[PDB]
PDB file of C-alpha atoms in Angstrom:
ATOM      1  CA  UNK M   1       0.000   0.000   0.000  1.00 37.43           C
ATOM      2  CA  UNK M   2       3.014   2.293   0.598  1.00 39.59           C
ATOM      3  CA  UNK M   3       3.340   4.262  -2.650  1.00 40.93           C
ATOM      4  CA  UNK M   4       4.314   7.940  -2.683  1.00 39.97           C
ATOM      5  CA  UNK M   5       4.796  10.906  -4.938  1.00 42.41           C
ATOM      6  CA  UNK M   6       7.176  13.830  -4.402  1.00 42.73           C
ATOM      7  CA  UNK M   7       7.338  17.240  -6.053  1.00 43.02           C
ATOM      8  CA  UNK M   8      10.776  17.636  -7.584  1.00 42.28           C
ATOM      9  CA  UNK M   9      10.644  20.984  -9.403  1.00 41.34           C
ATOM     10  CA  UNK M  10       8.528  22.724 -12.027  1.00 41.80           C
ATOM     11  CA  UNK M  11       5.777  20.185 -12.575  1.00 42.62           C
ATOM     12  CA  UNK M  12       8.067  17.226 -12.349  1.00 44.73           C
ATOM     13  CA  UNK M  13       7.087  14.639  -9.780  1.00 47.40           C
ATOM     14  CA  UNK M  14       8.941  11.588  -8.503  1.00 46.32           C
ATOM     15  CA  UNK M  15       6.816   8.499  -7.964  1.00 43.35           C
ATOM     16  CA  UNK M  16       7.843   5.621  -5.773  1.00 40.49           C
ATOM     17  CA  UNK M  17       6.204   2.209  -5.952  1.00 40.78           C
ATOM     18  CA  UNK M  18       5.974  -0.102  -3.007  1.00 43.91           C
ATOM     19  CA  UNK M  19       7.788  -2.687  -5.068  1.00 42.19           C
ATOM     20  CA  UNK M  20      10.807  -0.376  -4.471  1.00 41.19           C
ATOM     21  CA  UNK M  21      11.112   1.392  -7.816  1.00 41.46           C
ATOM     22  CA  UNK M  22      10.887   5.034  -8.864  1.00 42.51           C
ATOM     23  CA  UNK M  23       9.615   6.881 -11.917  1.00 41.45           C
ATOM     24  CA  UNK M  24       9.159  10.458 -13.062  1.00 41.56           C
ATOM     25  CA  UNK M  25       5.941  12.190 -14.167  1.00 39.46           C
ATOM     26  CA  UNK M  26       5.943  15.560 -15.953  1.00 38.79           C
ATOM     27  CA  UNK M  27       2.860  17.740 -15.913  1.00 41.79           C
ATOM     28  CA  UNK M  28       4.013  19.996 -18.750  1.00 44.78           C
ATOM     29  CA  UNK M  29       2.333  17.802 -21.393  1.00 50.97           C
ATOM     30  CA  UNK M  30       4.817  15.058 -20.644  1.00 44.65           C
ATOM     31  CA  UNK M  31       7.722  17.276 -21.629  1.00 47.52           C
ATOM     32  CA  UNK M  32      10.689  15.548 -19.945  1.00 46.51           C
ATOM     33  CA  UNK M  33       8.832  12.380 -18.878  1.00 46.10           C
ATOM     34  CA  UNK M  34       5.352  10.891 -19.438  1.00 47.59           C
ATOM     35  CA  UNK M  35       2.367  12.790 -18.065  1.00 47.35           C
ATOM     36  CA  UNK M  36       0.185  10.966 -15.497  1.00 44.50           C
ATOM     37  CA  UNK M  37      -2.461  10.389 -18.152  1.00 45.48           C
ATOM     38  CA  UNK M  38       0.174   8.746 -20.314  1.00 44.22           C
ATOM     39  CA  UNK M  39       1.110   6.548 -17.339  1.00 43.28           C
ATOM     40  CA  UNK M  40      -2.517   5.378 -17.242  1.00 40.96           C
ATOM     41  CA  UNK M  41      -2.693   4.588 -20.960  1.00 37.03           C
ATOM     42  CA  UNK M  42       0.552   2.642 -20.876  1.00 35.00           C
ATOM     43  CA  UNK M  43      -0.473   0.748 -17.720  1.00 33.89           C
ATOM     44  CA  UNK M  44      -3.645  -0.368 -19.451  1.00 35.49           C
ATOM     45  CA  UNK M  45      -1.565  -1.516 -22.408  1.00 33.77           C
ATOM     46  CA  UNK M  46       0.869  -3.292 -20.120  1.00 32.19           C
ATOM     47  CA  UNK M  47      -1.613  -5.022 -17.825  1.00 35.14           C
ATOM     48  CA  UNK M  48      -3.471  -6.206 -20.915  1.00 34.14           C
ATOM     49  CA  UNK M  49      -0.414  -7.418 -22.762  1.00 31.30           C
ATOM     50  CA  UNK M  50       0.722  -9.247 -19.644  1.00 28.12           C
ATOM     51  CA  UNK M  51      -2.463 -11.235 -19.364  1.00 32.99           C
ATOM     52  CA  UNK M  52      -2.578 -11.907 -23.088  1.00 35.65           C
ATOM     53  CA  UNK M  53       0.854 -13.436 -23.179  1.00 35.51           C
ATOM     54  CA  UNK M  54       0.121 -15.381 -19.987  1.00 35.66           C
ATOM     55  CA  UNK M  55      -3.023 -17.099 -21.304  1.00 38.40           C
ATOM     56  CA  UNK M  56      -1.215 -18.152 -24.467  1.00 37.14           C
ATOM     57  CA  UNK M  57       1.775 -19.577 -22.568  1.00 36.17           C
ATOM     58  CA  UNK M  58      -0.516 -21.556 -20.251  1.00 38.85           C
ATOM     59  CA  UNK M  59      -2.401 -22.871 -23.283  1.00 39.64           C
ATOM     60  CA  UNK M  60       0.967 -24.084 -24.572  1.00 38.91           C
ATOM     61  CA  UNK M  61       0.728 -21.670 -27.571  1.00 37.78           C
ATOM     62  CA  UNK M  62       4.098 -20.624 -28.977  1.00 42.81           C
ATOM     63  CA  UNK M  63       3.755 -16.861 -28.595  1.00 40.84           C
ATOM     64  CA  UNK M  64       6.981 -15.166 -29.692  1.00 40.71           C
ATOM     65  CA  UNK M  65       6.031 -11.527 -29.563  1.00 41.17           C
ATOM     66  CA  UNK M  66       3.409  -9.159 -28.383  1.00 40.88           C
ATOM     67  CA  UNK M  67       2.838  -5.509 -29.154  1.00 38.71           C
ATOM     68  CA  UNK M  68      -0.004  -3.184 -28.268  1.00 39.68           C
ATOM     69  CA  UNK M  69      -0.953  -0.185 -30.334  1.00 41.02           C
ATOM     70  CA  UNK M  70      -2.899   2.197 -28.098  1.00 41.14           C
ATOM     71  CA  UNK M  71      -5.118   4.943 -29.422  1.00 39.12           C
ATOM     72  CA  UNK M  72      -7.329   7.201 -27.352  1.00 39.88           C
ATOM     73  CA  UNK M  73      -9.510  10.283 -27.421  1.00 43.61           C
ATOM     74  CA  UNK M  74     -10.083  12.748 -24.618  1.00 43.11           C
ATOM     75  CA  UNK M  75     -12.259  15.773 -23.875  1.00 42.50           C
ATOM     76  CA  UNK M  76     -11.118  19.138 -25.164  1.00 38.68           C
ATOM     77  CA  UNK M  80      -9.682  16.281 -20.186  1.00 41.67           C
ATOM     78  CA  UNK M  81     -10.869  12.723 -19.448  1.00 41.83           C
ATOM     79  CA  UNK M  82     -10.262   9.840 -21.861  1.00 40.46           C
ATOM     80  CA  UNK M  83     -13.511   9.188 -23.689  1.00 43.32           C
ATOM     81  CA  UNK M  84     -12.162   6.098 -25.470  1.00 44.93           C
ATOM     82  CA  UNK M  85      -9.160   3.809 -25.435  1.00 46.54           C
ATOM     83  CA  UNK M  86      -8.525   1.213 -28.099  1.00 48.97           C
ATOM     84  CA  UNK M  87      -6.161  -1.660 -27.385  1.00 45.53           C
ATOM     85  CA  UNK M  88      -4.860  -3.173 -30.623  1.00 44.39           C
ATOM     86  CA  UNK M  89      -2.891  -6.406 -29.985  1.00 42.93           C
ATOM     87  CA  UNK M  90      -0.271  -7.669 -32.435  1.00 43.34           C
ATOM     88  CA  UNK M  91       0.505 -11.220 -31.434  1.00 42.45           C
ATOM     89  CA  UNK M  92       3.335 -13.031 -33.120  1.00 43.26           C
ATOM     90  CA  UNK M  93       3.917 -16.759 -33.017  1.00 43.03           C
ATOM     91  CA  UNK M  94       4.202 -20.122 -34.714  1.00 45.65           C
ATOM     92  CA  UNK M  95       1.031 -22.203 -34.663  1.00 47.43           C
ATOM     93  CA  UNK M  96      -1.213 -19.899 -32.692  1.00 49.13           C
ATOM     94  CA  UNK M  97      -4.863 -20.373 -33.595  1.00 47.56           C
ATOM     95  CA  UNK M  98      -7.326 -17.583 -34.047  1.00 47.32           C
ATOM     96  CA  UNK M  99      -9.646 -18.997 -31.459  1.00 47.57           C
ATOM     97  CA  UNK M 100      -6.874 -18.996 -28.866  1.00 47.87           C
ATOM     98  CA  UNK M 101      -5.805 -15.433 -29.573  1.00 47.42           C
ATOM     99  CA  UNK M 102      -9.403 -14.204 -29.472  1.00 50.02           C
ATOM    100  CA  UNK M 103      -9.954 -15.938 -26.137  1.00 50.59           C
ATOM    101  CA  UNK M 104      -6.747 -14.471 -24.689  1.00 53.41           C
ATOM    102  CA  UNK M 105      -7.493 -10.920 -25.852  1.00 53.55           C
ATOM    103  CA  UNK M 106     -11.057 -11.306 -24.652  1.00 51.51           C
ATOM    104  CA  UNK M 107     -10.411 -12.594 -21.139  1.00 53.80           C
ATOM    105  CA  UNK M 108      -7.561 -10.170 -20.756  1.00 53.93           C
ATOM    106  CA  UNK M 109      -9.574  -7.094 -21.700  1.00 52.45           C
ATOM    107  CA  UNK M 110     -12.861  -7.978 -19.986  1.00 51.40           C
ATOM    108  CA  UNK M 111     -12.012 -10.338 -17.135  1.00 52.90           C
ATOM    109  CA  UNK M 112      -8.344 -10.320 -16.028  1.00 53.79           C
ATOM    110  CA  UNK M 113      -6.850  -6.864 -16.548  1.00 53.30           C
ATOM    111  CA  UNK M 114      -7.521  -4.857 -13.453  1.00 53.22           C
ATOM    112  CA  UNK M 115      -6.486  -1.566 -15.054  1.00 55.83           C
ATOM    113  CA  UNK M 116      -8.819  -2.151 -17.981  1.00 56.71           C
ATOM    114  CA  UNK M 117     -11.693  -3.102 -15.762  1.00 57.90           C
ATOM    115  CA  UNK M 118     -11.293  -0.059 -13.495  1.00 57.93           C
ATOM    116  CA  UNK M 119     -11.270   2.313 -16.438  1.00 56.40           C
ATOM    117  CA  UNK M 120     -14.220   0.635 -18.162  1.00 54.50           C
ATOM    118  CA  UNK M 121     -16.632   2.162 -15.660  1.00 55.11           C
ATOM    119  CA  UNK M 122     -15.667   5.670 -16.893  1.00 54.85           C
ATOM    120  CA  UNK M 123     -14.040   5.197 -20.307  1.00 55.11           C
ATOM    121  CA  UNK M 124     -15.110   3.439 -23.483  1.00 55.55           C
ATOM    122  CA  UNK M 125     -12.502   0.668 -23.815  1.00 54.65           C
ATOM    123  CA  UNK M 126     -12.375  -1.364 -27.032  1.00 57.84           C
ATOM    124  CA  UNK M 127      -9.966  -4.093 -28.133  1.00 55.71           C
ATOM    125  CA  UNK M 128      -8.798  -5.681 -31.405  1.00 56.75           C
ATOM    126  CA  UNK M 129      -5.996  -8.002 -32.518  1.00 57.58           C
ATOM    127  CA  UNK M 130      -3.994  -9.452 -35.363  1.00 56.75           C
ATOM    128  CA  UNK M 131      -1.762 -12.484 -35.623  1.00 58.05           C
ATOM    129  CA  UNK M 132       1.606 -12.511 -37.399  1.00 56.41           C
ATOM    130  CA  UNK M 133       3.662 -15.612 -38.238  1.00 61.58           C
ATOM    131  CA  UNK M 134       7.243 -15.511 -36.905  1.00 62.52           C
TER     132      UNK M 134
ATOM    133  CA  UNK H   1      -2.938   9.092 -29.361  1.00 63.53           C
ATOM    134  CA  UNK H   2       0.131   7.086 -30.478  1.00 61.66           C
ATOM    135  CA  UNK H   3       1.185   5.181 -27.348  1.00 63.65           C
ATOM    136  CA  UNK H   4       2.489   1.612 -27.511  1.00 62.33           C
ATOM    137  CA  UNK H   5       3.621  -1.279 -25.393  1.00 62.80           C
ATOM    138  CA  UNK H   6       6.138  -3.972 -26.348  1.00 61.49           C
ATOM    139  CA  UNK H   7       6.895  -7.339 -24.776  1.00 60.80           C
ATOM    140  CA  UNK H   8      10.564  -7.400 -23.852  1.00 61.96           C
ATOM    141  CA  UNK H   9      11.055 -10.731 -22.063  1.00 59.85           C
ATOM    142  CA  UNK H  10       9.586 -12.640 -19.133  1.00 57.00           C
ATOM    143  CA  UNK H  11       6.742 -10.364 -18.108  1.00 55.81           C
ATOM    144  CA  UNK H  12       8.675  -7.207 -18.694  1.00 58.02           C
ATOM    145  CA  UNK H  13       7.037  -4.743 -21.040  1.00 57.24           C
ATOM    146  CA  UNK H  14       8.355  -1.542 -22.587  1.00 53.73           C
ATOM    147  CA  UNK H  15       5.890   1.331 -22.734  1.00 58.34           C
ATOM    148  CA  UNK H  16       6.258   4.274 -25.045  1.00 58.75           C
ATOM    149  CA  UNK H  17       4.363   7.520 -24.563  1.00 59.12           C
ATOM    150  CA  UNK H  18       3.423   9.775 -27.408  1.00 57.30           C
ATOM    151  CA  UNK H  19       5.310  12.535 -25.663  1.00 60.98           C
ATOM    152  CA  UNK H  20       8.387  10.511 -26.782  1.00 62.37           C
ATOM    153  CA  UNK H  21       9.417   8.806 -23.550  1.00 61.12           C
ATOM    154  CA  UNK H  22       9.714   5.167 -22.509  1.00 63.69           C
ATOM    155  CA  UNK H  23       9.155   3.234 -19.300  1.00 61.81           C
ATOM    156  CA  UNK H  24       9.236  -0.361 -18.123  1.00 60.57           C
ATOM    157  CA  UNK H  25       6.427  -2.377 -16.502  1.00 58.28           C
ATOM    158  CA  UNK H  26       7.046  -5.717 -14.770  1.00 55.65           C
ATOM    159  CA  UNK H  27       4.218  -8.176 -14.304  1.00 56.63           C
ATOM    160  CA  UNK H  28       6.039 -10.292 -11.722  1.00 57.60           C
ATOM    161  CA  UNK H  29       4.634  -8.243  -8.815  1.00 58.89           C
ATOM    162  CA  UNK H  30       6.689  -5.285  -9.952  1.00 60.27           C
ATOM    163  CA  UNK H  31       9.913  -7.214  -9.490  1.00 62.45           C
ATOM    164  CA  UNK H  32      12.377  -5.231 -11.639  1.00 63.15           C
ATOM    165  CA  UNK H  33      10.079  -2.258 -12.350  1.00 65.45           C
ATOM    166  CA  UNK H  34       6.620  -1.096 -11.198  1.00 66.54           C
ATOM    167  CA  UNK H  35       3.636  -3.277 -12.060  1.00 68.06           C
ATOM    168  CA  UNK H  36       0.890  -1.685 -14.207  1.00 67.17           C
ATOM    169  CA  UNK H  37      -1.310  -1.336 -11.137  1.00 63.65           C
ATOM    170  CA  UNK H  38       1.488   0.563  -9.440  1.00 64.62           C
ATOM    171  CA  UNK H  39       1.698   2.815 -12.514  1.00 64.94           C
ATOM    172  CA  UNK H  40      -1.986   3.641 -11.985  1.00 62.40           C
ATOM    173  CA  UNK H  41      -1.603   4.441  -8.285  1.00 63.61           C
ATOM    174  CA  UNK H  42       1.385   6.680  -8.902  1.00 57.12           C
ATOM    175  CA  UNK H  43      -0.332   8.445 -11.824  1.00 53.95           C
ATOM    176  CA  UNK H  44      -3.255   9.273  -9.572  1.00 56.33           C
ATOM    177  CA  UNK H  45      -0.821  10.635  -7.000  1.00 56.57           C
ATOM    178  CA  UNK H  46       1.014  12.611  -9.653  1.00 54.80           C
ATOM    179  CA  UNK H  47      -1.971  14.084 -11.480  1.00 55.21           C
ATOM    180  CA  UNK H  48      -3.381  15.114  -8.111  1.00 58.16           C
ATOM    181  CA  UNK H  49      -0.182  16.621  -6.799  1.00 55.99           C
ATOM    182  CA  UNK H  50       0.234  18.523 -10.049  1.00 55.45           C
ATOM    183  CA  UNK H  51      -3.125  20.203  -9.771  1.00 56.76           C
ATOM    184  CA  UNK H  52      -2.670  20.891  -6.076  1.00 56.39           C
ATOM    185  CA  UNK H  53       0.571  22.734  -6.554  1.00 58.66           C
ATOM    186  CA  UNK H  54      -0.871  24.576  -9.560  1.00 55.02           C
ATOM    187  CA  UNK H  55      -3.893  26.004  -7.717  1.00 57.21           C
ATOM    188  CA  UNK H  56      -1.681  27.246  -4.897  1.00 58.47           C
ATOM    189  CA  UNK H  57       0.798  28.929  -7.264  1.00 58.23           C
ATOM    190  CA  UNK H  58      -2.027  30.666  -9.143  1.00 59.73           C
ATOM    191  CA  UNK H  59      -3.486  31.824  -5.826  1.00 60.54           C
ATOM    192  CA  UNK H  60      -0.076  33.357  -5.116  1.00 63.31           C
ATOM    193  CA  UNK H  61       0.422  30.955  -2.139  1.00 61.44           C
ATOM    194  CA  UNK H  62       4.064  30.239  -1.333  1.00 64.00           C
ATOM    195  CA  UNK H  63       4.014  26.457  -1.681  1.00 65.88           C
ATOM    196  CA  UNK H  64       7.523  25.080  -1.160  1.00 63.75           C
ATOM    197  CA  UNK H  65       6.909  21.367  -1.155  1.00 65.15           C
ATOM    198  CA  UNK H  66       4.358  18.756  -1.893  1.00 66.93           C
ATOM    199  CA  UNK H  67       4.268  15.075  -1.065  1.00 65.24           C
ATOM    200  CA  UNK H  68       1.547  12.488  -1.476  1.00 61.68           C
ATOM    201  CA  UNK H  69       1.246   9.430   0.696  1.00 56.13           C
ATOM    202  CA  UNK H  70      -0.820   6.859  -1.196  1.00 60.70           C
ATOM    203  CA  UNK H  71      -2.517   3.928   0.462  1.00 60.62           C
ATOM    204  CA  UNK H  72      -4.825   1.457  -1.222  1.00 61.16           C
ATOM    205  CA  UNK H  73      -6.666  -1.814  -0.809  1.00 59.39           C
ATOM    206  CA  UNK H  74      -7.473  -4.344  -3.494  1.00 58.40           C
ATOM    207  CA  UNK H  75      -9.451  -7.565  -3.882  1.00 59.95           C
ATOM    208  CA  UNK H  76      -7.799 -10.798  -2.832  1.00 61.01           C
ATOM    209  CA  UNK H  80      -7.500  -7.859  -7.957  1.00 63.38           C
ATOM    210  CA  UNK H  81      -9.122  -4.433  -8.456  1.00 63.68           C
ATOM    211  CA  UNK H  82      -8.386  -1.488  -6.158  1.00 65.04           C
ATOM    212  CA  UNK H  83     -11.325  -1.127  -3.800  1.00 63.55           C
ATOM    213  CA  UNK H  84      -9.989   2.090  -2.249  1.00 65.67           C
ATOM    214  CA  UNK H  85      -7.263   4.648  -2.774  1.00 66.16           C
ATOM    215  CA  UNK H  86      -6.431   7.313  -0.235  1.00 66.03           C
ATOM    216  CA  UNK H  87      -4.500  10.388  -1.316  1.00 63.88           C
ATOM    217  CA  UNK H  88      -2.817  12.042   1.667  1.00 62.91           C
ATOM    218  CA  UNK H  89      -1.295  15.440   0.730  1.00 60.28           C
ATOM    219  CA  UNK H  90       1.573  16.961   2.712  1.00 62.77           C
ATOM    220  CA  UNK H  91       1.833  20.561   1.622  1.00 65.72           C
ATOM    221  CA  UNK H  92       4.726  22.641   2.818  1.00 63.58           C
ATOM    222  CA  UNK H  93       4.931  26.407   2.648  1.00 59.67           C
ATOM    223  CA  UNK H  94       5.185  29.795   4.300  1.00 60.67           C
ATOM    224  CA  UNK H  95       1.871  31.571   4.803  1.00 63.40           C
ATOM    225  CA  UNK H  96      -0.450  29.051   3.222  1.00 62.16           C
ATOM    226  CA  UNK H  97      -3.922  29.190   4.734  1.00 61.58           C
ATOM    227  CA  UNK H  98      -6.001  26.186   5.574  1.00 66.39           C
ATOM    228  CA  UNK H  99      -8.848  27.357   3.428  1.00 66.27           C
ATOM    229  CA  UNK H 100      -6.567  27.594   0.403  1.00 65.69           C
ATOM    230  CA  UNK H 101      -5.066  24.151   0.890  1.00 67.33           C
ATOM    231  CA  UNK H 102      -8.498  22.592   1.390  1.00 66.58           C
ATOM    232  CA  UNK H 103      -9.766  24.240  -1.790  1.00 68.02           C
ATOM    233  CA  UNK H 104      -6.728  23.067  -3.771  1.00 69.49           C
ATOM    234  CA  UNK H 105      -6.931  19.471  -2.527  1.00 67.78           C
ATOM    235  CA  UNK H 106     -10.667  19.513  -3.103  1.00 66.46           C
ATOM    236  CA  UNK H 107     -10.749  20.828  -6.665  1.00 67.01           C
ATOM    237  CA  UNK H 108      -7.791  18.678  -7.544  1.00 65.49           C
ATOM    238  CA  UNK H 109      -9.319  15.435  -6.297  1.00 64.65           C
ATOM    239  CA  UNK H 110     -12.917  15.995  -7.423  1.00 65.15           C
ATOM    240  CA  UNK H 111     -12.786  18.401 -10.358  1.00 66.23           C
ATOM    241  CA  UNK H 112      -9.373  18.717 -12.069  1.00 66.80           C
ATOM    242  CA  UNK H 113      -7.498  15.418 -11.838  1.00 66.75           C
ATOM    243  CA  UNK H 114      -8.493  13.334 -14.790  1.00 66.30           C
ATOM    244  CA  UNK H 115      -6.899  10.167 -13.414  1.00 66.77           C
ATOM    245  CA  UNK H 116      -8.747  10.555 -10.130  1.00 68.47           C
ATOM    246  CA  UNK H 117     -12.031  11.215 -11.822  1.00 71.59           C
ATOM    247  CA  UNK H 118     -11.738   8.205 -14.149  1.00 66.26           C
ATOM    248  CA  UNK H 119     -10.996   5.869 -11.271  1.00 65.52           C
ATOM    249  CA  UNK H 120     -13.755   7.278  -9.059  1.00 63.24           C
ATOM    250  CA  UNK H 121     -16.403   5.513 -11.129  1.00 63.88           C
ATOM    251  CA  UNK H 122     -14.920   2.120 -10.104  1.00 61.98           C
ATOM    252  CA  UNK H 123     -12.789   2.770  -7.012  1.00 59.79           C
ATOM    253  CA  UNK H 124     -13.465   4.446  -3.686  1.00 61.96           C
ATOM    254  CA  UNK H 125     -11.109   7.450  -3.780  1.00 59.10           C
ATOM    255  CA  UNK H 126     -10.630   9.511  -0.614  1.00 59.57           C
ATOM    256  CA  UNK H 127      -8.334  12.462   0.085  1.00 62.74           C
ATOM    257  CA  UNK H 128      -6.783  14.178   3.125  1.00 64.06           C
ATOM    258  CA  UNK H 129      -4.062  16.759   3.765  1.00 64.87           C
ATOM    259  CA  UNK H 130      -1.751  18.412   6.241  1.00 62.03           C
ATOM    260  CA  UNK H 131       0.200  21.641   6.144  1.00 59.90           C
ATOM    261  CA  UNK H 132       3.803  21.997   7.325  1.00 62.02           C
ATOM    262  CA  UNK H 133       5.672  25.282   7.828  1.00 61.17           C
ATOM    263  CA  UNK H 134       8.970  25.505   5.907  1.00 58.48           C
TER     264      UNK H 134
END
């Protein structure tokens, strides 16, 4: 539970996780480091990609790479919509398995996704590339 | 809108912001870098602290330091509750001004806070230290 953030200077803040790591947020439109809102977008991408690769490895599917293209829109400033586009690379991965993994990840397993869903329109999509 | 995440190895993912910066997320309980859920907690702290220090500087208040103690609980895994505790340091800052700033920040200006609120119980609190 012990996370903290500290004002460094300007609008730069230091962020310390309870897993013992530190990061930097920059409130000048992410000038020198990501803005908090960028943190959120990336965390959604990351949490999702984690679960997607996990499901495939458990299902013995030979997943070799995973990339997430994130797009979003926001009020002129809350996010109105985030799209997670998965690019899954592997050997014999079947469509049904990738759909399952992207599905369960985005709507059942990804905490970040599920928290945002109650306030943001979150959509997903995927493609499969041979290695 | 152009953020992305890339699988590096293990459960380590690279995250790239459209402001042109990169970070690392680690899905092994934030082993080597923060977990996505830690990203979210810190972004809420950061977005909040940003707005808090901004309001005070606009109101000509001599804010010298700002720290946020974050605590949270989560299902045994969504966050059920996040508490933002602000520690504002300054010279002649008045209580009414700090309350205002923490208030507007947490319930009107902080996008990250406001997105989470629809799914998580978010509470705030503050204290004021002389410099």
